[PDB]
């Protein structure tokens, strides 16, 4: 049979979203990285850690999730890392305040 299986305009949409599609694998690594410290400062309790410890865990877990390259930052994996880490973060600073 006489197939047009090579590389074709099709052939670079394929690598195309092979690579954005590593980019975005790396966004969420990056991210799941950073928010496992985010939920963890989020969820250290307000009696045990103070505003400051919250939030000192929210910037932790923000520094963690915001290590990924351009196209981790492009995809939506880090930028809901970093979500995730601020709203920690934030839980922590409202239950010391």
Same mark, same amino acid.
């Given at each position: 049979? @006489?197939? @047009?299986?090579? +590389?074709?305009?099709?052939? !670079?949409? *394929?690598? *195309? =979203?092979? !690579? !954005?599609? &590593?980019? $975005?694998?790396?966004? %969420?690594?990056?991210?799941? /990285? *950073? %928010? !496992? &410290? ?7 309790? %307000?009696?045990?850690?103070?505003? #400051? /410890? $919250? #939030?000192?865990? +929210?910037?932790? +877990?923000?520094?963690?999730? /915001?290590?990924?390259?351009?196209? $981790? #930052?492009?995809? =939506?994996?880090?930028?809901? *890392? &970093?979500? $995730?880490?601020?709203?920690?973060? /934030? ?7």
């Amino acid at each position: 049979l @006489t197939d @047009t299986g090579l +590389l074709s305009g099709s052939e !670079e949409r *394929v690598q *195309v =979203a092979l !690579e !954005e599609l &590593q980019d $975005l694998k790396g966004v %969420w690594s990056e991210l799941s /990285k *950073v %928010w !496992e &410290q985010i939920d963890q400062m989020k969820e250290q309790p %307000w009696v045990s850690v103070q505003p #400051r /410890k $919250l #939030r000192q865990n +929210l910037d932790a +877990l923000l520094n963690q999730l /915001k290590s990924f390259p351009a196209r $981790l #930052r492009q995809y =939506a994996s880090y930028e809901f *890392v &970093q979500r $995730l880490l601020k709203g920690y973060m /934030k839980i922590n600073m409202l239950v010391i305040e």
